Amino acid sequence: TGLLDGKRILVSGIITDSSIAFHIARVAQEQGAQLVLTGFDRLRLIQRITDRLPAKAPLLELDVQNEEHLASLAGRVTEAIGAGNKLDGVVHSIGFMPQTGMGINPFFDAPYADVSKGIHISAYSYASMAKALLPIMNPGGSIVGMDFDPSRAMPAYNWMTVAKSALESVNRFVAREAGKYGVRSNLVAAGPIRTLAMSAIVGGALGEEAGAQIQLLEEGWDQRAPIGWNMKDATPVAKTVCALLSDWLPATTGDIIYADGGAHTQLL
Amino acid sequence: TGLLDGKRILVSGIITDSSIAFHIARVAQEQGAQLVLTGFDRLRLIQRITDRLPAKAPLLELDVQNEEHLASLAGRVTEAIGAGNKLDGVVHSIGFMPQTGMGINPFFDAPYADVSKGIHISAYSYASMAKALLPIMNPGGSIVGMDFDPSRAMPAYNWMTVAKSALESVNRFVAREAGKYGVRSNLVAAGPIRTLAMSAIVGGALGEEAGAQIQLLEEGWDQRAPIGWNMKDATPVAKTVCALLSDWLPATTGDIIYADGGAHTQLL
Amino acid sequence: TGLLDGKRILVSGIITDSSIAFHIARVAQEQGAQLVLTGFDRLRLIQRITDRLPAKAPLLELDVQNEEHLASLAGRVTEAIGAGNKLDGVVHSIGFMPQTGMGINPFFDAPYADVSKGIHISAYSYASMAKALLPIMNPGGSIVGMDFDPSRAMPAYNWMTVAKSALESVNRFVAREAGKYGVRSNLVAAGPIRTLAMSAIVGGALGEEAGAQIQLLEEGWDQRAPIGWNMKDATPVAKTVCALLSDWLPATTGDIIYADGGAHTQLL
Amino acid sequence: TGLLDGKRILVSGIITDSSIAFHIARVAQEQGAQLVLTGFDRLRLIQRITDRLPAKAPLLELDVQNEEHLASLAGRVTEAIGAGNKLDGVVHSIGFMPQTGMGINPFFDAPYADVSKGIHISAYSYASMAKALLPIMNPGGSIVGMDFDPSRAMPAYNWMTVAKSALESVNRFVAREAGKYGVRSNLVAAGPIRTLAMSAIVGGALGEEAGAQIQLLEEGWDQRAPIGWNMKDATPVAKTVCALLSDWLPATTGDIIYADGGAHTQLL
Ligand SMILES: NC(=O)c1ccc[n+]([C@@H]2O[C@H](COP(=O)([O-])OP(=O)(O)OC[C@H]3O[C@@H](n4cnc5c(N)ncnc54)[C@H](O)[C@@H]3O)[C@@H](O)[C@H]2O)c1
Ligand SMILES: NC(=O)c1ccc[n+]([C@@H]2O[C@H](COP(=O)([O-])OP(=O)(O)OC[C@H]3O[C@@H](n4cnc5c(N)ncnc54)[C@H](O)[C@@H]3O)[C@@H](O)[C@H]2O)c1
Ligand SMILES: NC(=O)c1ccc[n+]([C@@H]2O[C@H](COP(=O)([O-])OP(=O)(O)OC[C@H]3O[C@@H](n4cnc5c(N)ncnc54)[C@H](O)[C@@H]3O)[C@@H](O)[C@H]2O)c1
Ligand SMILES: NC(=O)c1ccc[n+]([C@@H]2O[C@H](COP(=O)([O-])OP(=O)(O)OC[C@H]3O[C@@H](n4cnc5c(N)ncnc54)[C@H](O)[C@@H]3O)[C@@H](O)[C@H]2O)c1
Ligand SMILES: Cc1cc(C)nc(SCc2cc(C(N)=O)no2)n1
Ligand SMILES: Cc1cc(C)nc(SCc2cc(C(N)=O)no2)n1
Ligand SMILES: Cc1cc(C)nc(SCc2cc(C(N)=O)no2)n1
Ligand SMILES: Cc1cc(C)nc(SCc2cc(C(N)=O)no2)n1
Ligand SMILES: [Mg+2]
Ligand SMILES: [Mg+2]
Ligand SMILES: [Mg+2]
Ligand SMILES: [Mg+2]
């Protein structure tokens, strides 16, 4: 009697035990969902990481920049879940921006090839995954992507923020297409989460000024949040993704749910 | 094993079997919640209506314009739920705007006394109820109010839209106060629902032009909604309110969840 | 050859030489506009203040809560400007919230009578003035109101923020009515301005905590603003109001122009 | 005594006499501005078109996808305006999306190479131009870009809408950089304009369904606009761009001004 009992859900984006997708996968399994996982490039690493999940789940390779991986994806998922079975859910928890597009590298100094790669992975791939998976999704189904509120510019995030603005726009169009299948498409805008990369950035991996700026942003976020914000805890974000994967928000689509402690609703 | 098992929830706003609050109360009970209901003025009528709910629930009188009703409310709820017990949820499903403030009566012709009454009932009362109930709410608790997207002006709704804009602002402040109790505060922005009053308006109860305009708005809403919009079905709205009353959106506060078929995310 | 040469403009809201309306009136006159001023209650004081403006301007009494003042307003303006002449512009620079609705007084402790008075003056009066003045405005005309961005809740501002949210909604409806006259209606959302009342608040006139909170908000505003924000200088705000009164934004209506140093477009 | 007397302004984006940039250039010249024009690929055509402007203006080649054109741009402008002189204004009126990214071609069928080209030209180039031109702009200067409101998804526009969402995000970051030079950066969100390409689209150049959908969008736009919307008249848009190029909106940056007849503020 979990929130997601009997649901078949694809979860992309696990790389480490601190990935937001690891926690989404863990909570979905705690809630009775049967998962299919997708991983990029380091499959041996991802398998060892996913071995820590409450239940076993088939892992499929998916490089979103690879058209062959996308073209074979639905067939590979069908084989993993069994012929005649379809997905009820899809989680996009994929994001990347080359170092030139984030941090202390001046915003104007990011070459377009780098920005384009980041936009391909972080925004266009949300449409790529929906195109590949909608033909194998059941009516009442749900597609969820991870967002970081890009409504206002912020230091260091730079082109990653531009990619999120593009992602929010993509989500509204994916919802139009997904609707033809009786499927919802939404994003969860999370507050900052101390993933391995976020800790490294605050530690100065992308320059001192950028680290200092992200640390101030994190502190301000918890201060603004009426219920507080714990950057070390991805569970509230994972629960929110599961809320969207469930039958409990059936009239919400092309939309954004903020799992940010309410920080975006307050100025100070 | 319902979504709201063991939760004690107050639900205001039932007047007819077509009230959005009736459906919120029905779904909350189907999901294991123990309810306390509040009713305005016509208690005998409300009791006969609520007798149709899946389970028995104490009904308390609450006129939000009456300071004595508000001052005695927490004590009356405690008596109904038993000393030592507190509420986990509160539903505000209250709205009113005198006839001069809605319909064919020109927007400029609404006297302030009428607008002020409508704003008192539809917006200020969200803060009034939170003030009365927060001292008897448990941490992890949830306050939910009903909204109708007032981001853009629309024909006929007139001062009711102004009252909703004020309500959205009130919600952000209530979240600040509710946070001190470990309580969330959010609104559900519903698409148009064919309540008794909505059917009467489309039928011309507030003038021909206003009826024609609201009918066009309803049609456009379903056309824009990527998953469609059924104005005759309050169930998707009721489910969304229950999603907010549950433990599944724990990092969302001072916010608005749109249960509108995704219509507000599309232009055409 | 001023920006507003030959335009007849009504300007309300002058009380001191630090009123935003004093600077709007000064810049409009520097730009060739012929003004009619309205004042509340302290006409002798207002006249002595307005004697400092670059040019002489008739001053009319206007209490926005007084229906007789509103009913006689168009006739009184016509007498001041001459029969056969109409206004090209109207400036609403009126705002009030009783002490219980702002500052350290808890948000929940503001009685409705106080909130309603504040909403009457700060929001409903924008519609009251447009109703009175549209019959004496020329096509191509412009109505401008003063806003303080209420999209996110903030400390101390409390019910004044709720009143601004209501004002933004009122503006969108006033635009619908004003359009029938070929008239535009818009708000200027200013950054914080050190008026006499703002200085008194920071100084602790409405409690220590509220003063400290508003001082932090002011500092954050200049820090966020990509071009900086000088709270001691109302000139950039006055220039923006004149931009809206001019023929230079002819396709903008029911809208909000932010004269806030760009602070609302940045998170940090 | 024009609005832009003595200002040196670069205007990009003229291709035909129906280009929005042609009208921006015409109004800026009527208002006393001294222009430098940039053109893409068809310089002989652009020169013959620009010969119709009120005054002579040097024309420089600028392909925004060409790093050499961008690297030599400031030097070429300085040569055209004279050593010791700098620009007061910059107009970005550049947009492109390959046919696969707009129209009847399904949203999912646009290959990334096409989307990336469109995003390069329509969004990234706003940052490219600011990087090249800020070192030759005077304090008090203004950068203006052309936007088409992408807040909600719409039929046919597809990836062009995604590119506009990315552009709005880019604008907020450009404002941060431009602020260091005492320069403002803003976008004008225009209503639909019957350029040669728009007429061809409505005529079915990108498929019947797309043409029909854009025609419905145009009709709805004028219906919603409280002051109406004339798609055959770029003058109100050109005037708005000049308002931003002037000294009259000195505290507005990282922002969006809507020259859309107020259509985006109304639902119906
Ligand atoms: N960490 C935060 O503060 C934060 C905040 C809000 C939203 N988000 C978003 O959450 C999502 C997950 O990120 P995270 O913070 O868990 O970091 P992460 O590094 O753990 O997850 C990013 C994932 O993207 C994958 N990926 C990269 N390139 C790929 C490709 N070519 N094909 C397929 N997958 C590819 C990586 O392998 C990794 O699994 C991202 O969309 C991120 O932007 C993160
Ligand atoms: N019907 C729609 O299309 C629609 C759309 C979105 C949101 N909403 C909102 O949903 C909520 C419920 O409205 P509904 O559509 O179910 O209509 P309804 O008439 O069934 O419910 C309104 C309720 O407000 C109560 N109320 C009025 N004055 C009161 C007072 N002084 N004290 C206490 N309660 C008082 C009424 O008794 C009634 O129970 C309202 O906030 C409404 O604005 C309605
Ligand atoms: N000061 C700021 O930081 C700030 C920021 C943004 C917007 N604004 C807005 O600018 C406008 C002008 O305020 P200000 O800051 O110049 O303060 P102010 O005190 O100088 O101006 C407020 C004016 O409202 C008038 N008023 C009050 N009650 C009235 C009534 N019954 N009838 C008619 N007029 C009445 C007062 O007489 C006064 O002239 C207000 O709308 C205010 O909210 C102020
Ligand atoms: N037409 C509308 O309905 C509408 C509405 C709102 C905003 N806009 C925007 O206004 C701007 C001007 O477009 P328009 O409608 O006048 O169409 P247009 O075709 O007349 O202008 C587009 C311009 O972009 C130029 N361009 C394309 N690729 C380029 C490159 N590689 N380098 C440099 N310049 C390049 C073209 O040469 C052309 O001059 C665009 O940003 C467009 O999206 C248009
Ligand atoms: C909002 C947000 C913040 C961070 C640090 N990573 C992410 S996605 C993960 C990631 C890592 C990198 C990188 N440059 O290593 N780029 O993207 N998204
Ligand atoms: C958004 C929306 C629409 C309607 C018809 N009623 C409501 S609340 C119910 C109601 C009824 C009335 C009335 N004038 O009878 N005023 O308010 N809210
Ligand atoms: C946004 C903003 C801020 C302030 C201090 N005053 C205003 S209007 C002026 C005013 C003064 C008072 C008062 N309580 O004296 N209420 O309103 N508006
Ligand atoms: C919002 C909007 C609408 C249109 C028709 N063109 C533009 S920019 C001009 C353009 C033309 C094309 C094309 N595919 O020919 N792509 O972009 N922008
Ligand atoms: Mg294991
Ligand atoms: Mg019964
Ligand atoms: Mg004098
Ligand atoms: Mg010529």
Short mmCIF file of N, CA and C in Angstrom, two decimals, chain B residues 149 151-155 213 216-218 220-221 224 263-268, chain D residues 149 151-155 213 216-218 220-221 224 263-268:
data_model
loop_
_atom_site.label_atom_id
_atom_site.label_comp_id
_atom_site.label_asym_id
_atom_site.label_seq_id
_atom_site.Cartn_x
_atom_site.Cartn_y
_atom_site.Cartn_z
N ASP B 149 -6.95 31.52 -10.41
CA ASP B 149 -5.84 32.29 -10.99
C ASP B 149 -6.22 33.73 -11.37
N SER B 151 -3.89 36.19 -12.10
CA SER B 151 -2.70 36.80 -12.71
C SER B 151 -3.03 37.73 -13.87
N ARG B 152 -4.13 37.43 -14.57
CA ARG B 152 -4.61 38.24 -15.70
C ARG B 152 -6.06 38.60 -15.45
N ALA B 153 -6.47 39.81 -15.85
CA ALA B 153 -7.88 40.17 -15.66
C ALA B 153 -8.78 39.35 -16.65
N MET B 154 -10.03 39.16 -16.26
CA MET B 154 -10.97 38.40 -17.08
C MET B 154 -12.35 39.05 -16.97
N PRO B 155 -13.21 38.85 -17.97
CA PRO B 155 -14.55 39.44 -17.87
C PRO B 155 -15.36 38.81 -16.73
N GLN B 213 -19.73 35.55 -21.42
CA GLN B 213 -18.29 35.70 -21.20
C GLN B 213 -17.72 34.54 -20.40
N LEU B 216 -17.62 31.44 -22.55
CA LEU B 216 -16.46 31.45 -23.45
C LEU B 216 -15.17 31.08 -22.69
N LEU B 217 -15.02 31.60 -21.46
CA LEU B 217 -13.86 31.32 -20.60
C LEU B 217 -13.75 29.80 -20.30
N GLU B 218 -14.89 29.16 -19.98
CA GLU B 218 -14.97 27.72 -19.71
C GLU B 218 -14.54 26.91 -20.92
N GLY B 220 -12.71 27.90 -23.56
CA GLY B 220 -11.29 28.18 -23.83
C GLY B 220 -10.39 27.39 -22.88
N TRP B 221 -10.82 27.26 -21.62
CA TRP B 221 -10.08 26.56 -20.56
C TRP B 221 -9.84 25.09 -20.94
N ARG B 224 -7.44 24.87 -24.05
CA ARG B 224 -6.04 25.17 -23.65
C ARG B 224 -5.40 24.06 -22.81
N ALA B 263 -4.17 24.44 -18.07
CA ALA B 263 -4.62 25.56 -18.92
C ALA B 263 -3.80 26.86 -18.77
N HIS B 264 -3.36 27.18 -17.55
CA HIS B 264 -2.59 28.43 -17.33
C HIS B 264 -1.18 28.42 -17.91
N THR B 265 -0.70 27.26 -18.40
CA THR B 265 0.66 27.12 -18.97
C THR B 265 0.63 27.24 -20.49
N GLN B 266 -0.57 27.45 -21.07
CA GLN B 266 -0.73 27.48 -22.52
C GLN B 266 -1.45 28.74 -22.92
N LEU B 267 -1.08 29.31 -24.05
CA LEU B 267 -1.74 30.54 -24.47
C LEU B 267 -2.96 30.20 -25.34
N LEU B 268 -2.80 29.22 -26.22
CA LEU B 268 -3.83 28.70 -27.12
C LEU B 268 -3.57 27.20 -27.27
N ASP D 149 6.75 36.99 -25.91
CA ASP D 149 6.38 36.38 -24.63
C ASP D 149 6.31 34.84 -24.68
N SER D 151 6.17 32.85 -21.85
CA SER D 151 5.73 32.39 -20.52
C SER D 151 4.79 31.20 -20.57
N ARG D 152 4.02 31.10 -21.67
CA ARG D 152 3.09 29.99 -21.90
C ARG D 152 3.38 29.38 -23.25
N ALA D 153 3.24 28.06 -23.38
CA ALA D 153 3.48 27.45 -24.69
C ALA D 153 2.33 27.83 -25.68
N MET D 154 2.64 27.82 -26.96
CA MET D 154 1.66 28.18 -27.98
C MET D 154 1.89 27.29 -29.21
N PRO D 155 0.84 27.08 -30.02
CA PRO D 155 1.05 26.24 -31.21
C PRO D 155 2.01 26.91 -32.20
N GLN D 213 -3.35 28.10 -36.85
CA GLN D 213 -3.08 28.32 -35.43
C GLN D 213 -2.54 29.71 -35.16
N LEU D 216 -5.30 32.24 -35.57
CA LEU D 216 -6.16 32.30 -34.38
C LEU D 216 -5.47 33.09 -33.25
N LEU D 217 -4.16 32.88 -33.07
CA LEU D 217 -3.36 33.58 -32.05
C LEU D 217 -3.39 35.11 -32.27
N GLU D 218 -3.24 35.54 -33.54
CA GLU D 218 -3.29 36.96 -33.94
C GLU D 218 -4.64 37.57 -33.61
N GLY D 220 -6.97 36.47 -31.44
CA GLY D 220 -7.14 36.46 -29.99
C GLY D 220 -6.37 37.60 -29.33
N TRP D 221 -5.18 37.90 -29.86
CA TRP D 221 -4.29 38.95 -29.34
C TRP D 221 -4.97 40.32 -29.39
N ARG D 224 -8.00 40.40 -26.89
CA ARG D 224 -7.52 40.50 -25.49
C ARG D 224 -6.94 41.87 -25.15
N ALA D 263 -2.20 42.76 -24.17
CA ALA D 263 -2.80 41.42 -24.33
C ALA D 263 -2.36 40.39 -23.27
N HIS D 264 -1.09 40.43 -22.85
CA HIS D 264 -0.59 39.45 -21.85
C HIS D 264 -1.14 39.64 -20.44
N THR D 265 -1.86 40.76 -20.18
CA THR D 265 -2.41 41.06 -18.85
C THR D 265 -3.87 40.62 -18.75
N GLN D 266 -4.41 40.05 -19.84
CA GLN D 266 -5.83 39.69 -19.90
C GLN D 266 -5.96 38.24 -20.32
N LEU D 267 -6.93 37.54 -19.77
CA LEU D 267 -7.09 36.14 -20.14
C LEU D 267 -8.04 36.02 -21.34
N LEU D 268 -9.10 36.81 -21.33
CA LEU D 268 -10.11 36.89 -22.38
C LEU D 268 -10.58 38.35 -22.43
#
